[PDB]
C-alpha cells in the first residue's frame, strides 16, 4: 500500500528470519529456485539474462551458487532495513551490480517481486503479504535506481 513502516520492517524481519537457515544452504536454494522457476515461467526471455550462471540448469552448481548469492543479498537488505542510512549504501551497491547487466529492467524486478509473493507463503509460517510487499518494494526501489523499465 503506502510505505515500509518501522512496524513493517520488524514484521518483514521476522517472516524472513524464520525460514532462514543459518547453518546450511538447503532451504536457501530451495526457496531461491522456487522463485526463479516462477519468474522464468511468467517472463520467457528472462532466463536469457542468467547465461553467465547457467540459468538453464537451475540445479547446476553455477546457478545454485548464484541463488545462494541472491538470497544472501536480500538477507543483507532485509536486515539492513533497521539501519536505513547503511541500507541506502548497500542497495546502491546492489543497484550498480545490476546496472552492469544488460537486460535487467525495472519491470523485471516488478516481476520477481510477484514471484516471491507467490513463494514465501508456501515456505514461511504465518506470512503477511502486505507488510512484506511494502518493505520488499522499498528494497527494490533502491536496487533499481538507473535501470531502464
Amino acid at each position: 500500500a503506502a510505505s515500509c513502516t518501522t512496524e513493517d520492517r520488524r514484521e518483514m524481519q521476522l517472516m524472513w528470519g524464520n525460514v532462514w537457515s543459518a547453518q546450511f544452504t538447503g532451504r536457501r536454494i530451495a526457496i531461491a529456485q522456487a522463485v526463479f522457476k516462477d519468474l522464468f515461467a511468467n517472463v520467457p526471455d528472462a532466463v536469457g539474462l542468467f547465461g553467465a550462471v547457467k540459468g538453464d540448469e537451475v540445479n547446476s552448481n553455477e546457478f545454485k551458487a548464484h541463488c545462494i548469492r541472491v538470497v544472501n543479498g536480500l538477507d543483507s537488505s532485509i536486515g539492513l532495513l533497521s539501519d536505513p542510512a547503511t541500507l541506502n549504501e548497500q542497495l546502491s551497491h546492489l543497484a550498480t551490480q545490476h546496472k552492469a547487466r544488460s537486460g535487467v529492467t525495472k519491470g523485471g524486478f516488478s516481476a520477481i517481486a510477484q514471484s516471491f509473493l507467490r513463494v514465501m507463503p508456501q515456505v514461511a509460517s504465518c506470512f503477511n503479504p502486505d507488510a512484506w510487499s511494502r518493505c520488499f518494494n522499498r528494497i527494490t526501489t533502491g536496487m533499481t535506481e538507473p535501470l531502464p523499465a
Binding site: 543459518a22 544452504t25 536457501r28 545462494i68 544472501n72 538477507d75 536486515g79 547503511t86
Partner: protein
C-alpha cells in the same frame, strides 16, 4: 590439530551461527572484526579507500563489512557442499583478483574473524582447531 574435516565444519557452522547472531548485532560483530584488523595492520586501510576505510564508523564502510561477513556466511554455509563451495569461492576470488591482497592480509582478517567469534561465544567453548583450518580453506580458495 588442523584439517577442516566434516565434523570441524559442522562445528564452525554452528559457532558461526551464534556469532552472526539473529540479524541485529551484526553491525557490532562487523565493527569488532574490521576494527581489530586495522589495529593490527593500520596500513591495510589504504585498500579500502572506496568505502571509507579511514572511518569504519560509516554507513559506507558498515555496508562494506556487511558484504564481507555476508560472503563469509555463504562460504561457511557451503562448507558441507564441496562442489558448490568452490564455485562460490571462485566467484569471491574473481571479486578480489586485481586488488593486491597479500597472504598475510588474509591471515589477519582470519585471525580477526576468530577473535570476533570468540568474543561473542566465549573462550570456554570455541573450537580453534576447527575455525583455524576451515577458515583457511575459504581463504585459500579466494586466494586464487
Amino acid at each position: 590439530d588442523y584439517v577442516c574435516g566434516p565434523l570441524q565444519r559442522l562445528k564452525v557452522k554452528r559457532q558461526w551461527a551464534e556469532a552472526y547472531g539473529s540479524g541485529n548485532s551484526r553491525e557490532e560483530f562487523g565493527h569488532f572484526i574490521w576494527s581489530h584488523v586495522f589495529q593490527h595492520s593500520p596500513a591495510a586501510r589504504d585498500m579500502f579507500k572506496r568505502v571509507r576505510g579511514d572511518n569504519i564508523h560509516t554507513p559506507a564502510f558498515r555496508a562494506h563489512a556487511t558484504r564481507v561477513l555476508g560472503g563469509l556466511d555463504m562460504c561457511i554455509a557451503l562448507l558441507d557442499d564441496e562442489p558448490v563451495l568452490n564455485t562460490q569461492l571462485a566467484h569471491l576470488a574473481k571479486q578480489h583478483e586485481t586488488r593486491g591482497v597479500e597472504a598475510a592480509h588474509y591471515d589477519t582478517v582470519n585471525h580477526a574473524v576468530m577473535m570476533g567469534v570468540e568474543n561473542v561465544i566465549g573462550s570456554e567453548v570455541f573450537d580453534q582447531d576447527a575455525w583455524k583450518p576451515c577458515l583457511n580453506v575459504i581463504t585459500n580458495g579466494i586466494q586464487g
